[PDB]
Amino acid sequence: ERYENLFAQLNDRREGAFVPFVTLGDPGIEQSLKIIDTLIDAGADALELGVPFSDPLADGPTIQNANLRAFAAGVTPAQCFEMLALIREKHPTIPIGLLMYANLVFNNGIDAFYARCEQVGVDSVLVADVPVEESAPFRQAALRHNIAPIFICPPNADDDLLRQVASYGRGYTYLLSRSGVTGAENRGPLHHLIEKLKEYHAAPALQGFGISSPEQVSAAVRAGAAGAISGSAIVKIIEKNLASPKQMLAELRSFVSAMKAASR
Amino acid sequence: ERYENLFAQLNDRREGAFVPFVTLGDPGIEQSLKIIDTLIDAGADALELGVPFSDPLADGPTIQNANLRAFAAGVTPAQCFEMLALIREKHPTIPIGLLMYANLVFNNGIDAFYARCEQVGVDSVLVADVPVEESAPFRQAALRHNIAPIFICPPNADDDLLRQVASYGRGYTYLLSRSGVTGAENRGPLHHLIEKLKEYHAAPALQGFGISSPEQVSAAVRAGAAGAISGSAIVKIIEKNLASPKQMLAELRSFVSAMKAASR
Amino acid sequence: TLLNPYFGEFGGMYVPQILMPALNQLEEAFVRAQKDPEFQAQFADLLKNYAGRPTALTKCQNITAGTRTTLYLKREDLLHGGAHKTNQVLGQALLAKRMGKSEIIAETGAGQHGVASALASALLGLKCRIYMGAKDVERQSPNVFRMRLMGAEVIPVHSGSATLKDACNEALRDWSGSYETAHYMLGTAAGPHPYPTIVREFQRMIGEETKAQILDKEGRLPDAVIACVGGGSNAIGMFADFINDTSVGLIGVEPGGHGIETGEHGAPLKHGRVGIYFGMKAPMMQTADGQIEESYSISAGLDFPSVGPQHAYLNSIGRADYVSITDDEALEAFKTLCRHEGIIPALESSHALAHALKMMREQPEKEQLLVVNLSGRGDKDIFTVHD
Amino acid sequence: TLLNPYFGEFGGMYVPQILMPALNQLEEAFVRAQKDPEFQAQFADLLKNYAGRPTALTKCQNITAGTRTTLYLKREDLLHGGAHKTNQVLGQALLAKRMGKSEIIAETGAGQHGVASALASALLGLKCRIYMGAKDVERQSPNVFRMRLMGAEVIPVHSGSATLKDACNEALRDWSGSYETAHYMLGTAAGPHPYPTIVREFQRMIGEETKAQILDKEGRLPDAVIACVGGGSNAIGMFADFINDTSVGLIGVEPGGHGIETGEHGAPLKHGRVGIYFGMKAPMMQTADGQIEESYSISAGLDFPSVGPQHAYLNSIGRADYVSITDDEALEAFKTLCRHEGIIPALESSHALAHALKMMREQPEKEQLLVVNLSGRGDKDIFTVHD
Ligand SMILES: Nc1ccccc1SCCCCP(=O)(O)O
Ligand SMILES: Nc1ccccc1SCCCCP(=O)(O)O
Ligand SMILES: *Cc1c(COP(=O)(O)O)cnc(C)c1O
Ligand SMILES: *Cc1c(COP(=O)(O)O)cnc(C)c1O
Ligand code: NA
Numbered sequence A, B: 001e002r003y004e005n006l007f008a009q010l011n012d013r014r015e016g017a018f019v020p021f022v023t024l025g026d027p028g029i030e031q032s033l034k035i036i037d038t039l040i041d042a043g044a045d046a047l048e049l050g051v052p053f054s055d056p057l058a059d060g061p062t063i064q065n066a067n068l069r070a071f072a073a074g075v076t077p078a079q080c081f082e083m084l085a086l087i088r089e090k091h092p093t094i095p096i097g098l099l100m101y102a103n104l105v106f107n108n109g110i111d112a113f114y115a116r117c118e119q120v121g122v123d124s125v126l127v128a129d130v131p132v133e134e135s136a137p138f139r140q141a142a143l144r145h146n147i148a149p150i151f152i153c154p155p156n157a158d159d160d161l162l163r164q165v166a167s168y169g170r171g172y173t174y175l176l177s178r179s180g181v182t183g184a185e186n187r188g189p190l191h192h193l194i195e196k197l198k199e200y201h202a203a204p205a206l207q208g209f210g211i212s213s214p215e216q217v218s219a220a221v222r223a224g225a226a227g228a229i230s231g232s233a234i235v236k237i238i239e240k241n242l243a244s245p246k247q248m249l250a251e252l253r254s255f256v257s258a259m260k261a262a263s264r
Numbered sequence C, D: 001t002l003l004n005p006y007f008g009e010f011g012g013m014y015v016p017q018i019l020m021p022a023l024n025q026l027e028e029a030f031v032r033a034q035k036d037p038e039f040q041a042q043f044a045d046l047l048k049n050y051a052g053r054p055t056a057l058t059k060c061q062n063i064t065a066g067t068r069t070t071l072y073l074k075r076e077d078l079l080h081g082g083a084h085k086t087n088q089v090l091g092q093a094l095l096a097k098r099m100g101k102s103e104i105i106a107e108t109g110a111g112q113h114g115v116a117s118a119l120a121s122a123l124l125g126l127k128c129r130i131y132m133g134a135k136d137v138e139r140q141s142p143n144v145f146r147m148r149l150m151g152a153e154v155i156p157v158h159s160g161s162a163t164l165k166d167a168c169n170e171a172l173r174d175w176s177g178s179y180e181t182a183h184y185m186l187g188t189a190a191g192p193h194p195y196p197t198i199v200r201e202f203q204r205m206i207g208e209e210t211k212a213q214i215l216d217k218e219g220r221l222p223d224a225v226i227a228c229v230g231g232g233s234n235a236i237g238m239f240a241d242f243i244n245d246t247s248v249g250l251i252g253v254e255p256g257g258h259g260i261e262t263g264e265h266g267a268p269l270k271h272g273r274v275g276i277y278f279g280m281k282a283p284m285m286q287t288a289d290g291q292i293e294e295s296y297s298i299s300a301g302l303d304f305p306s307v308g309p310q311h312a313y314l315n316s317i318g319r320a321d322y323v324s325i326t327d328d329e330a331l332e333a334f335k336t337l338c339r340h341e342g343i344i345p346a347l348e349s350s351h352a353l354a355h356a357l358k359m360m361r362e363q364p365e366k367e368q369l370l371v372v373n374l375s376g377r378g379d380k381d382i383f384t385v386h387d
């Protein structure tokens, strides 16, 4: 119940959660591990980790290249779970969620994929290409292995979707700021959806997509969300400093400090 | 009545007529004039002259190139008639026949083309691409200007064609040795056709196509023909000695001497 | 002959004496075949189940919006091989077979007649000999290869200007010494009789289908049918069934090339002189001396330096009207049909469309029911127009 | 949903939550359209007067001489655009218009779906956005230019392996943020429901026409219908009307490339592993890790690294049988049809012919009534086969 505790703790502090996203193994395994520790050290409340896929159809150019860089480095799903185990061995309480594509979890059995998550210490899993309509087996497998199935609540959702997401989801509800794909390039009135989700006893909502400025996370918290997820803004810093790993870390630090402070 | 006299004279000598063919202006006007005089001096009884055309559809590769060489020299139909006038001014009795294509005679009026022939001293005209079925205007124009219309009697001719050729033709009947086009490349039993033509009071028959050896003209005479026409064998000598005009003449001389002697 | 070889002053049989029996033979085979219900059903079967007959008549709505013109297109681009040329060769190939012949001789410039002659022979078990001027062989690698892949022997003609002109020459040259076993499949409604009559008759479907089609869709005959004129086969095929329909205008379009004024065109019927060539009396691309000239056009398929005798005749009596369209004009009609109708027209046919487009644009308020013969597909010209 | 998204284990709607309303919308538009006699007549009119429907069924006699096989060919090569792909896009474009949409998004590899999507939009006044992997853009200059000349915007995708795979990715990426005004015209009988069902339904003409055609010409249904399988649209269109006819064999042919053994093929239904991708549960060109792989084949049009769910289902229950043909084998069938029948087949369809040719040759004494779906024209491949 890693998310349960983080949110309860954050509430006692009347605080919002800042959750950055990165691709495991970008730009290299060793540098990626280093990035994640910097992310945690600078203040990230939880983590959203993506394992390299050949067809990230819900991702914009920034993360598309994160996958390309990770691939260019020879990172595999096996290598990722190895990475996840070390991260958990290092950081005991920080919630860990995986951004996954369907084939990677269906490949060697759905059940077997979630058992691995439990073994490694993963907390949640969001399968970008599985709608609620198609989530039955993923949900079931997740719950069975004490993994929280993360559901995306889009901005256009009707009452039926909302009631579904609230009932099935766990850990946190992924509130979609926008339509389209993952991108800091474009920004994104979630008041009604957040009240409705709170009304249906849904998991605390985390707003994701386009969140790239300190003001954006404070706005997320003010509306009633428990926090904000930011990815392309982080990945863009890795992209920016490929020739200077040390500079990468220091810049990653300043950004997530600015971002976490804005949720307090 | 140039043909009338030549044949009557040749008969009193129990002789056959040897008629060579060349393209006017091949390889040049001046060299062509020189060739024709050599042809006459070596023994040719009559002449068959072709004026350069862009589409000689009844001619094989040898004469096709004679036209190409004449064209390359800038020879025109106007230049040809000029050439014909000088040849007649030089040689008063030798029969002169023109190998013509329809467009060249229809171009500036059919009537006007035959008046020019009469003016220049031409004796006959064979329009390669005009069958008897289509010769009415050409025949009429020729007769009107004292020019003999030459008709081709093919080896496959039926009684009706034979009777037609005999009635319309004048000067000489062009007996086709073969099918196909003009070529010394291939050779070619005209006994029945020659008896039939003689039966219908046709003009003396001259065998043309493939005739390239002394034995071929003696054979033509033996069968009952009044002579033989030879072109590609002559043109091939011009083709052979383009780089040696003097050699051309001497070789042209030996060939037509061998050929004329074979008709005696 | 059993039929008239002339259309007024035009036509004839201007071939050496030697080929006359081959022309009389062909004519009788045609008169017989024409009266033969068994030949008729064999030809109709091939046209239908093999070629794609009947082709569509498409109303081009987007193209004529904002005007009083209703335009239709006879879809000969949808016929097997991508052009109207296929109808013809099928019937001529059966005629060769009827004549006991088992060999085909062909003439080609752009490559289209060659490809059609080659396909017909492949289907009907005839041995195919094709003649192409060296300039065209180098210029048409795709069609040459298409012809060879279809089992045809392709022979380059380096003689003269090495184009359609000289190819047509080598064909007859060959035919003089082989007519006994081989049939010369002439590629257009020109040449010596019986060819202008045969080709028309075997291309007649076009107009016959169009009449029924327009009578169905509109309950009225068109005000005018338009077709490009290279040698005249697609045009005459369109015109034929409408000749006795005096209210229907017949418009033939000749290539204007770079401009008639430039002398860089392929418009003999209108801007050339009557002469005698290719076994025919007809208007011609001639020099002042009577030497045969070449026809120019952006579209290689309209390069026949002459034109069919029936067109020259229809023109003379006022039954049909002939106009010309330049390269840029045809290029424009090509571009327009691609974008507003989604149909890629042959540059040959683009000359025809371009004129109908003019008829519209110049007088947008004139009520008009037009039918353009889209004699062919334009995939062939994607590269040309591209450069 | 109003209809079942699955064919047994296969199919589904594996797209991000955001695209679900766009898929439910499309489905209702289809169920309505399907019951709409006014939509039905509009579609039948376009298929007929614009596309060339009905296409011919040609008996190939020369090809099967000396054996007990009677072979016919469904002539989808004679359809406007040169392939069966045209039927589909016309109906999908009208669906977009029914949905009040005025924009089209498309996916293309070989270029064929793009050209068809582009032509449909040009005809129906839709704005067309087309996505092509950079490797394919460079590889397909003719089709890219054909697409642009038809008023379509062509966008290269440099992401991933820059092929059909990544193109299909950019399409959905775009569609997530534009489904409100744009319709994604998926090019095959695969992807998330309702696409496998829609494409089948809009390709059904093929089989329906073939049944009537064979019943006319032979008074009997065929022993087997054969069709190549890239993503499954032409095959399923052939199969559909014959599924309840248990005496008729359904044979799908997948590319074998350089040899299945080489691992250089495009045969997922038979030699790939089931996975979840492109909004679907289906057999796949996958790595051991679950990374999506590319399909290989001499014919670019059979490069879809997956296959339609209905085929995977028909295969599983034994209703349909799937086999594979190598490059050299398809090259042979290509060559053979050119020479004995005079028809230039697409290399895509050549895989289908090659199998029927095997069925014949291996058992020349077996009485057999076969129908091969000639899904397309081969002019496109004259250069490839040449080199
Ligand atoms: N990658 C991804 C794709 C689909 C659903 C959730 C995620 S995780 C968070 C992504 C945030 C990226 P950005 O801040 O640029 O919008
Ligand atoms: N040139 C020509 C064409 C048609 C009819 C007669 C002639 S004139 C004599 C030609 C002789 C040429 P060859 O001896 O090679 O057969
Ligand atoms: C062959 C060709 C022509 C030239 O045609 P004729 O009809 O004999 O004048 C015209 N259009 C196309 C498409 C052609 O292929
Ligand atoms: C587009 C294409 C294909 C691939 O087809 P599917 O039918 O969806 O499998 C096959 N044949 C041709 C000719 C094509 O152009
Ligand atoms: Na012309």
Ligand code: NA
Residues within 6 Å of the ligand: D229, D230, D231, D266, D267, D268, D295, D302, D303, D304, D305, D306, D307
């Ligand atoms: Na496939």
